[PDB]
Every structure is written in C-alpha cells, then in structure tokens.
Amino acid sequence: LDRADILYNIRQTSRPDVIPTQPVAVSVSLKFINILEVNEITNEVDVVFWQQTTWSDRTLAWNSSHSPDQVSVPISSLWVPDLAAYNAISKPEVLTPQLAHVVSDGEVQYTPSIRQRFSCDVSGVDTESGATCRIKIGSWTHHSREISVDPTSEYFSQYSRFEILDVTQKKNSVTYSCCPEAYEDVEVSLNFRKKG
Amino acid sequence: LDRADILYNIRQTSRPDVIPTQRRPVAVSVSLKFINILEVNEITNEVDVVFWQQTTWSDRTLAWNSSHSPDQVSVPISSLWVPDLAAYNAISKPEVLTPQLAHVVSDGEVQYTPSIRQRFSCDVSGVDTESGATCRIKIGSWTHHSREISVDPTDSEYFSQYSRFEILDVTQKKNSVTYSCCPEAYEDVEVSLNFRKK
Amino acid sequence: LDRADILYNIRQTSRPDVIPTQRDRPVAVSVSLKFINILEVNEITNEVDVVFWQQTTWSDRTLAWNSSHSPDQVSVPISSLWVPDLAAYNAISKPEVLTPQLAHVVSDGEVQYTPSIRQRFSCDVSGVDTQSGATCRIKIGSWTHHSREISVDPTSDSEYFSQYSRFEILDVTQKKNSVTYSCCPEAYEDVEVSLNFRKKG
Amino acid sequence: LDRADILYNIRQTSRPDVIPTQRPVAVSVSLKFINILEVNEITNEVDVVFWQQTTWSDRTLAWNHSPDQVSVPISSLWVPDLAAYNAISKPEVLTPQLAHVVSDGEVQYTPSIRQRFSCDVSGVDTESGATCRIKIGSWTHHSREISVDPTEYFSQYSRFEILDVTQKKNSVTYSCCPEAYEDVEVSLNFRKKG
Amino acid sequence: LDRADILYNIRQTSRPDVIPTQRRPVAVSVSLKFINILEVNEITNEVDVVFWQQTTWSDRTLAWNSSHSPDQVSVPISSLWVPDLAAYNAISKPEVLTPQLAHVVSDGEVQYTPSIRQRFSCDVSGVDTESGATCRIKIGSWTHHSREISVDPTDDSEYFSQYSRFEILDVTQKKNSVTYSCCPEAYEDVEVSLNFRKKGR
Numbered sequence: 003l004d005r006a007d008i009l010y011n012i013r014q015t016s017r018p019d020v021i022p023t024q025p026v027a028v029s030v031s032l033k034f035i036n037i038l039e040v041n042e043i044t045n046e047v048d049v050v051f052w053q054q055t056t057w058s059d060r061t062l063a064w065n066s067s068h069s070p071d072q073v074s075v076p077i078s079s080l081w082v083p084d085l086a087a088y089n090a091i092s093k094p095e096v097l098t099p100q101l102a103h104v105v106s107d108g109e110v111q112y113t114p115s116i117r118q119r120f121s122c123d124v125s126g127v128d129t130e131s132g133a134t135c136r137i138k139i140g141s142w143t144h145h146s147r148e149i150s151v152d153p154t155s156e157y158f159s160q161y162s163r164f165e166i167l168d169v170t171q172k173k174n175s176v177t178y179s180c181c182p183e184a185y186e187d188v189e190v191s192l193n194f195r196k197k198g
Numbered sequence: 199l200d201r202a203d204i205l206y207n208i209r210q211t212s213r214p215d216v217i218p219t220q221r222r223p224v225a226v227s228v229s230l231k232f233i234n235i236l237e238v239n240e241i242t243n244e245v246d247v248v249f250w251q252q253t254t255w256s257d258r259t260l261a262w263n264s265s266h267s268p269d270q271v272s273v274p275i276s277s278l279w280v281p282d283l284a285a286y287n288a289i290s291k292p293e294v295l296t297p298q299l300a301h302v303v304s305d306g307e308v309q310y311t312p313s314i315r316q317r318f319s320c321d322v323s324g325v326d327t328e329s330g331a332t333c334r335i336k337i338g339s340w341t342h343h344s345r346e347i348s349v350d351p352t353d354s355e356y357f358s359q360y361s362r363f364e365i366l367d368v369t370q371k372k373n374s375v376t377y378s379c380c381p382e383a384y385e386d387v388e389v390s391l392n393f394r395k396k
Numbered sequence: 397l398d399r400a401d402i403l404y405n406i407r408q409t410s411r412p413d414v415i416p417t418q419r420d421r422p423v424a425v426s427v428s429l430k431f432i433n434i435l436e437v438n439e440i441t442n443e444v445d446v447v448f449w450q451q452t453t454w455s456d457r458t459l460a461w462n463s464s465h466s467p468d469q470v471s472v473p474i475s476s477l478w479v480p481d482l483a484a485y486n487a488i489s490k491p492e493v494l495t496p497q498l499a500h501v502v503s504d505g506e507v508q509y510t511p512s513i514r515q516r517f518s519c520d521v522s523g524v525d526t527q528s529g530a531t532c533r534i535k536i537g538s539w540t541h542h543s544r545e546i547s548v549d550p551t552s553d554s555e556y557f558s559q560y561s562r563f564e565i566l567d568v569t570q571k572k573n574s575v576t577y578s579c580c581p582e583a584y585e586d587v588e589v590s591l592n593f594r595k596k597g
Numbered sequence: 598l599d600r601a602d603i604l605y606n607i608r609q610t611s612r613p614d615v616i617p618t619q620r621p622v623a624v625s626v627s628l629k630f631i632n633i634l635e636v637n638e639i640t641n642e643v644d645v646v647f648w649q650q651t652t653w654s655d656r657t658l659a660w661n662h663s664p665d666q667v668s669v670p671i672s673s674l675w676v677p678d679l680a681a682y683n684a685i686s687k688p689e690v691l692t693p694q695l696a697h698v699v700s701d702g703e704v705q706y707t708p709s710i711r712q713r714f715s716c717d718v719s720g721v722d723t724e725s726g727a728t729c730r731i732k733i734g735s736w737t738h739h740s741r742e743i744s745v746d747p748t749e750y751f752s753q754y755s756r757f758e759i760l761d762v763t764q765k766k767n768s769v770t771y772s773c774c775p776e777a778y779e780d781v782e783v784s785l786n787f788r789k790k791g
Numbered sequence: 792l793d794r795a796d797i798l799y800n801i802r803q804t805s806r807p808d809v810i811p812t813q814r815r816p817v818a819v820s821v822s823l824k825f826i827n828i829l830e831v832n833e834i835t836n837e838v839d840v841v842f843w844q845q846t847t848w849s850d851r852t853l854a855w856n857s858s859h860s861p862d863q864v865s866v867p868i869s870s871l872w873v874p875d876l877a878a879y880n881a882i883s884k885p886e887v888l889t890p891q892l893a894h895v896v897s898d899g900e901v902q903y904t905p906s907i908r909q910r911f912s913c914d915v916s917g918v919d920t921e922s923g924a925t926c927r928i929k930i931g932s933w934t935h936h937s938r939e940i941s942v943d944p945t946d947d948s949e950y951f952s953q954y955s956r957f958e959i960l961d962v963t964q965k966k967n968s969v970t971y972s973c974c975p976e977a978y979e980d981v982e983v984s985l986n987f988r989k990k991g992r
C-alpha cells in the first residue's frame with residue numbers, strides 16, 4: 003500500500019454521512035492564537051484559535067507494515083463530528099486548508115484554525131484579574147450515547163492587545179427541551195486581560 | 199439494519215425535491231428558541247437576533263422497521279426534503295451557525311433545528327422602557343400553500359444572560375394569508391418577541 | 397402523474413441553459429417589483445438599500461403536463477429550470493436573495509419565480525426628506541438576450557411595504573423601454589420601475 | 598439546428614480548460630464605466646462599477662437555418678483569465694454570468710463588476726481631476742497564447758463625473774517567467790462634482 | 792499531443808488528493824512578491840497586505856513528452872495537487888484576487904502564483920519611524936511534515952504599488968523547522984520579514 007492506494011480506498015469506502023460508532027469519543031482542545039476585537043459593552047469577543055479535534059474511525063484503518071503511518075485527507079471525504087460553539091454569534095471562518103490526519107490505526111485528527119465571534123462575559127477585561135470568557139462546544143445533533151466530548155499561551159500571538167492568564171476546561175452533559183437524551187459539551191474558560 | 203444501511207437507503211431513495219404530502223398538507227411545527235439579541239436600532243426599527251429555528255414535520259417515505267435498529271439518525275439536510283420556510287420581515291439572509299443536520303426518527307418524524315443569526319425589520323419602539331418592545335417575526339412557507347404546507351406553533355430558557363437585553367414574553371400566533379399573485383392561502387406563524395433593554 | 401413523477405421529468409428533461417423560445421418569437425417575461433422595505437438612504441452619495449420581491453413570470457411549454465389527474469402546480473429549484481437573465485442596471489451590490497430559490501411551474505408551462513431580494517442601487521435620492529419625496533428609478537432587463545429573444549413587460553400596488561420602515565411609499569410607476577447598446581446591433585428591452593418615496597417623521 | 602441543439606453541442610464538446618489557440622487568441626478589453634462609488638484621496642483607493650466587455654474568438658464553437666447567436670453559461674466555455682493587477686478586492690460580478698456565442702465562433706462576455714483599486718486619486722477634487730490607471734491582462738497566458746487589445750453608461754447620480762478615458766496596450770516581462778505578458782492600461786480621468 | 796490532449800490527461804489522471812512524493816519530500820518554493828500595504832494599525836498590531844504568493848513544486852505524474860507539444864499549460868488548481876500552505880499569523884482567510892490557474896511545464900514543474908489580500912497579526916511598531924516596522928509572516932504546510940513537504944525561499948519592490956501609503960525598505964526570508972505539541976514530526980515554514988514604513992510628508 004502507498005499513499006495513492008490508501009487515499010483511493012478512503013475515498014471510495016469512507017461514509018462521511020455515517021458516524022463511526024461501535025459512543026465515538028471526541029477530544030476537543032482549543033489552542034488560542036489571538037484575541038482581536040473585545041467589546042465590554044456588548045459582551046462580544048473575536049477570537050482566533052485552533053480547534054484540535056480527535057476521534058477514532060476503525061473503518062479507515064489499514065495494515066501499515068510496509069505503508070505510510072499517516073495520510074492527509076480532505077474532510078469532505080471523512081465523517082466529522084458536528085461540533086458547534088453554542089455561544090458563537092458568527093459562523094466559523096475556517097482559515098486553513100480543510101485537511102485531516104488519518105493514522106493507520108484509524109485515529110483521525112482535524113485541527114482547523116478558526117476565527118469566530120462569541121457572546122460571553124467580557125467584564126473585567128481591563129483589570130488585572132481579567133475577564134473570563136466561557137466557550138461552549140458540543141455535538142449539535144448527536145447525544146451522549148453517540149458522541150461524547152472530552153478535554154485533552156503556547157501559540158498565542160505576542161502582538162495581541164491581550165494576554166492569556168489561564169485556560170481551564172470543563173465537561174458537561176445537558177438535557178434540552180426538544181429531546182429526551184443528554185448532549186455532552188466542553189466549556190473552555192478563557193481568562194484574559196488587556197496588556198499595558 | 200444499522201446506521202450505515204439506514205443512511206444509505208435515505209440517500210438513495212429520499213427525494214429532497216419532493217414534498218412528502220400524504221393522502222393533505224404536511225404539518226410543519228415551528229418554534230423559535232431565542233438565544234441572543236445583539237443589536238437593536240430604535241431609529242431604523244431593525245434588530246439582530248440569534249435563535250434556534252426548531253422545525254418539525256413528518257416524512258413517511260423515510261420510515262424504517264426499528265425492531266433491531268437505531269430509533270434515530272442524523273442526516274444532512276441536502277439529502278432530505280425540507281420545508282421552504284422564510285421570515286417575511288427578514289432583511290438579511292439567514293446565517294446558519296450550526297452543522298446542517300436533521301434528526302430522522304424511525305417513524306418518519308423529521309426535526310431540524312439550526313441556530314440562526316438574522317436581521318429583522320420590526321417594531322423596536324419602547325425597547326428602553328419597562329413594558330419593552332414587541333418585535334413580531336413572520337415565518338411561513340415561501341412557495342407552498344395551505345393545502346401543501348400548514349404551519350403550527352409548538353421563553354428565556356436558552357437566552358444568553360450576557361445579552362444587553364432580556365425577554366419578557368414570547369407569544370405565537372398562526373395566520374392564513376392570501377397574496378395578490380396566487381389564489382390559494384399561505385399559512386404563517388407570527389412569533390411576538392417582547393423584550394427590553396436591561 | 398404525481399408530484400414525484402412531474403419533478404423527475406422536469407429534472408431529467410428541462411434544459412436550464414436553453415431559452416424556451418417558441419417559433420422564433422421572444423419569451424414574454426413579466427416583471428413586477430413588490431417593495432417590502434427601504435433600509436438605508438444616502439442623499440449625499442445617491443444610494444439606497446431596498447428589499448423587494450422580484451416577481452418574475454414567463455412561459456416554458458416544454459414543462460407542461462397533462463393535469464387531468466395530476467397536480468396543477470409544483471415547486472421546482474431554479475437550478476433545474478431555465479430562468480431569464482434579468483439584471484438591475486443601476487444596482488451597485490450583487491442581489492442578496494433572502495428566500496428559498498424555488499419557482500412555481502404550472503401544468504400549462506407557466507413559470508413564476510418571486511425571490512425576496514436585498515440590493516443597493518444608485519439613483520436619485522434628492523428630495524427624500526420633502527413632502528413630494530424622492531423618485532428612485534430602477535432599470536431591470538435581460539443582460540444578454542435582445543428583444544427578439546426576451547421581451548420584458550410590467551404587470552399593481554405599499555401593499556407589502558413594512559410599516560416599520562423610516563420610509564413610506566407615495567407612488568410606484570412602471571415604464572417599458574427598448575435600448576440599443578454600443579456592443580450589439582440589436583435592441584434590449586428593460587423595465588424602469590419608478591419608486592416615489594419619502595422619509596416619515 | 599435550433600438553440601437546444603447548439604447549446605447541447607457546446608456543452609458536450611467545448612473544452613473550458615482549453616485555450617482556443619489557432620496555430621495567440623486575440624482578446625478585446627473595453628471597460629464601460631457605470632459608477633464611481635467611493636474615493637479616498639488619503640489611501641489612494643477607489644471603488645468602481647464597470648462593464649468588463651471582453652471579446653474573443655473560439656472556432657470550435659462555430660456552427661452552420663439556425664440562430665446567429667446563443668447565450669451560454671461561462672462555466673461551459675473557455676474564458677480568458679483576465680485580472681486587474683492593481684485591484685485590492687476580488688471582482689464582485691453583479692450580473693448573470695452568461696456569454697454571447699455567435700455562429701462564427703466569436704464570443705463576447707460583458708459582466709458588470711464592482712471592484713476596489715489602488716491607484717492615483719490625487720487631484721480628484723480639482724478641475725483637471727484625478728487619473729486612475731487600471732491594468733488588465735491575462736494572469737497566466739503570455740503574448741503568444743493571449744494578446745489583449747483596446748476597442749456613455751455612467752450614472753448621472755454619481756458624485757463624480759468622467760472627463761476622459763484613454764486606453765494603452767503594454768507588454769511586460771516578469772521575473773518569474775521568460776515570456777512577455779500583455780496588458781491593457783485604462784486611464785480613467787475623473788473628478789468630484791461641485 | 793496538443794493542449795486539449797494534455798489537459799484531458801491531466802484532468803483524467805492527476806490525483807489532487809495525492810501528494811506527489813517521489814522517494815523524498817516534495818520541495819516547495821515560496822516567494823512573496825509584495826504588491827500593496829493597505830491598512831496598518833499600530834495599536835492592534837494588524838496589517839492588511841496584498842501579495843503574490845508564488846509557489847513552485849514538482850509533480851512528475853503530470854510530465855509529458857514535449858517533442859511536438861506545448862512546453863506549458865494552464866490548469867485549474869482544482870485538477871492538481873496543491874501544497875496545503877497556510878500563513879500561521881493570518882487573521883483573515885486568504886482572499887484570492889486572481890483566476891485560480893497554475894502552470895504545468897512538460898517536465899512536471901508546477902507553478903501557482905495567486906494574488907492574495909490577507910490581514911496579518913505582526914509587529915507594526917516603528918512603522919512611522921525612519922527604520923520602519925518589521926512584519927514577520929510565517930508560511931508553511933499545515934498538515935505535511937518535513938519528510939512530506941519541505942519549504943524553501945527563492946526584488947523587494949519590484950511590483951510594489953507606488954500609490955501605497957507605505958514603502959518597502961527590505962524583505963528577508965528565513966527557513967525554520969518546528970515541532971508542535973500535537974505531533975512527533977517537524978514541520979517546515981518560511982518566515983518572510985517585511986521591513987516597511989510610512990512614506991514621509
């Protein structure tokens with residue numbers, strides 16, 4: 003098997019519409035890159051971050067004995083978790099090529115760099131303790147038995163008007179009026195402040 | 199039947215162009231779940247709203263025997279027929295913020311609940327008083343009349359606490375209107391959003 | 397015939413690229429703007445932001461069907477139909493289509509398409525704040541089809557105009573023209589819709 | 598042959614990826630200015646609306662009791678890869694993207710375009726006006742594959758008015774490539790009305 | 792072989808999804824040709840740049856016998872494999888201003904040079920001084936590591952707009968190889984340092 007073959011098989015046989023269930027365990031980890039437009043009045047922030055998403059799809063696995071361990075695949079050719087930011091107020095602008103990593107064991111990783119507007123608590127952004135903006139990310143349509151989400155300044159721009167004090171992640175499981183099942187989400191708390 | 203099979207059948211056989219009318223109008227439930235109010239302009243009479251447009255209807259052609267099968271799957275709306283709902287007083291096109299997937303239940307019940315950000319032209323007068331403004335949003339089928347599509351109704355439950363606004367009350371009303379172009383009557387739902395500045 | 401069959405036939409056999417001209421005559425296209433809202437007037441720059449239904453009506457017999465025991469009408473995605481290449485000559489933004497892009501096809505082959513459009517125009521905004529109002533003239537015609545392939549004609553009424561606009565409509569008049577352009581020897585038809593409107597209090 | 602047949606043949610057999618070179622393709626470019634929307638004399642940026650009348654020949658589209666002309670989606674035709682070198686926004690096409698194909702194989706495409714340019718806006722408020730120079734040519738085809746050549750509707754409601762339009766053809770060599778690429782420079786001489 | 796045949800083969804047989812690796816990483820040349828600097832903000836540390844992103848690599852599977860054939864064709868990038876380059880410090884998605892066509896030479900040499908407008912996060916301090924600001928732009932493969940894709944640099948103002956509010960003092964390029972937390976391999980990038988300043992009074 004070479005890359006050409008592996009990609010050919012994936013394209014022919016992966017079922018992008020089909021959740022690779024046996025719940026699918028989805029890792030979500032936000033890597034903040036920039037904070038661009040804070041508004042303390044309206045409580046809205048403009049954030050640039052890598053949405054590192056990781057899950058497993060065994061139907062993509064291959065014998066890597068004399069083959070590559072990894073390939074890059076267009077996400078249009080793969081099933082992808084339907085993650086959404088609940089408190090996003092703009093649709094996600096994907097800044098990067100929409101390719102994922104598929105490892106021979108069936109491990110998939112997709113890490114787009116996203117610019118997005120959020121509605122969150124921006125109060126205290128200009129103080130030393132800073133503001134704490136809470137970002138809620140989960141599967142839009144898959145409940146806890148189908149998709150489970152779990153957590154996992156390094157790449158933060160030194161040229162931002164803001165710095166990052168702390169990032170904490172917290173997993174929740176919420177029931178909504180529409181549906182009887184529980185949906186999981188990850189709440190990433192971004193504690194940041196305006197530099198001097 | 200597993201998911202793979204069900205989704206395969208749906209994709210192969212659903213007819214997204216074809217309204218799944220049975221014997222009668224497809225009965226479409228519409229329920230707006232307000233999430234945020236973002237800009238208000240009392241001069242221009244325009245508001246910017248974020249809301250879940252929970253839409254529910256029935257398509258028997260999608261039904262399957264759920265004996266030893268899943269009760270529910272998630273399907274791309276591009277592979278399903280979807281009611282052609284529009285907000286009559288919208289002045290921007292709907293920005294869909296969420297993955298465009300619907301629920302199909304084994305009985306053929308379909309639910310689609312996108313989160314939408316949209317601008318409306320409505321009555322914003324009194325937004326800064328304590329009785330608040332009452333913005334009326336009109337949603338109905340754009341091209342299907344009452345005998346093809348009928349719409350029916352189903353507050354601060356998911357509304358953001360970080361909005362500069364708060365919701366006093368949400369009331370829903372069903373109407374049936376005849377337009378100059380066409381002899382038949384088209385149904386709509388008018389959702390009245392009563393809100394005020396904090 | 398049921399809906400499924402009719403839609404199937406249309407999808408298989410309609411030729412969206414092919415103007416349904418008959419007997420070497422022109423396709424008669426009705427254009428009627430139903431104004432919904434006026435959003436952003438600028439008397440300095442002479443630009444207005446308008447929301448309107450562009451009710452477009454024409455005939456493709458090749459879509460026609462025996463409606464004896466069949467529906468009289470279906471809704472069809474415009475991507476599956478030939479559509480007149482109408483353009484607003486004095487538009488300065490591309491048309492933002494607000495509504496689902498579906499047309500009516502009636503069993504006789506009559507097609508109607510009525511998108512709600514938001515668009516900016518360059519027009520005469522002078523007098524918008526007076527009692528006689530401004531008169532903005534909107535020019536709509538086929539971009540590439542001349543008078544012998546496409547003819548445009550007017551069809552009526554503040555009927556659907558928003559009561560919550562800062563503006564109110566005094567009068568709407570329509571007037572058909574036939575113009576020759578430098579590029580081409582043939583004449584192209586257009587409709588000029590005159591929107592007479594003014595600011596409210 | 599009727600329209601249906603001609604369009605069917607074009608669709609089946611035209612090769613949109615294939616430049617209709619005959620043993621360069623001669624492309625006519627003629628900007629018909631419709632409107633000038635915004636001008637910043639500080640930033641040297643203008644917002645213009647114009648018809649980009651483009652004309653060329655593709656014999657592989659020619660045909661013999663038939664129509665002399667059809668309207669064809671440009672996605673079904675080969676189209677010159679023209680670009681405005683000093684544009685700073687991508688072109689917003691305002692009009693239906695259809696071209697004229699004439700039975701002899703002459704193709705004309707005239708989209709109405711709104712676009713922002715970086716050019717000399719100095720003097721826009723004087724009597725002699727500013728002169729904004731717009732540079733249009735093939736992005737990827739050199740002079741042997743594509744040659745560009747030069748060849749009223751301006752709105753009376755613009756704040757601006759057009760004094761003169763002059764066109765001039767150039768042939769430039771770029772660092773990347775050994776061949777020369779042709780362009781047309783359209784000089785738009787305009788001023789603010791008083 | 793004529794153009795039609797060569798383009799037909801390419802469309803039929805090129806594998807856009809498949810990196811054209813040849814026993815060794817694909818060698819990708821990156822060279823930014825700055826055209827304009829549009830909107831500097833010294834407070835927010837953001838710049839709006841227009842530049843040609845001249846990208847060059849080799850794909851032997853596209854090669855052909857050019858004996859009685861063209862030496863070069865223009866091919867839609869959707870029919871070719873293209874390096875997944877990204878600007879790490881870009882804060883808007885790249886606006887491609889030009890037709891998305893690449894050159895394929897008969898030897899399999901591919902060149903793609905879109906004109907891009909993009910907003911970057913970088914050091915804008917000193918933009919109004921005589922020594923100027925130095926904005927550092929980091930471009931590399933998003934998903935291919937050093938053994939799959941290697942990036943290499945290839946004057947300054949050759950095509951820079953004389954009508955910009957800015958002038959270019961110097962452009963330097965620097966190749967790096969970085970390991971990220973996610974992955975065990977090293978990813979290459981090029982850092983283009985754009986030294987520019989506000990033009991005087």
Ligand SMILES: Brc1ccc(N2CCCNCC2)cn1
Nearest residue numbers: 142178185300301309310311
């Ligand atoms: Br269909 C369908 C059903 C439920 C939901 N949501 C409710 C449950 C958790 N995610 C938020 C939206 C969305 N689409």
Ligand SMILES: Brc1ccc(N2CCCNCC2)cn1
Nearest residue numbers: 340377384499500508509510
């Ligand atoms: Br085609 C076609 C026919 C009628 C309508 N409208 C009239 C019927 C009710 N909703 C408003 C849209 C739109 N397109």
Ligand SMILES: Brc1ccc(N2CCCNCC2)cn1
Nearest residue numbers: 539577584696697705706707
């Ligand atoms: Br192709 C082609 C030929 C002519 C025109 N125009 C001229 C005739 C009427 N509308 C204005 C544009 C547009 N495209």
Ligand SMILES: Brc1ccc(N2CCCNCC2)cn1
Nearest residue numbers: 736771778893894902903904
């Ligand atoms: Br591939 C490729 C090669 C060269 C060019 N440029 C240089 C020659 C003509 N105009 C500027 C574009 C564009 N793409």
Ligand SMILES: Brc1ccc(N2CCCNCC2)cn1
Nearest residue numbers: 102103111112113933971978
């Ligand atoms: Br999938 C996948 C793997 C690696 C990366 N990044 C890390 C390595 C270099 N480019 C920056 C993003 C992103 N997505």
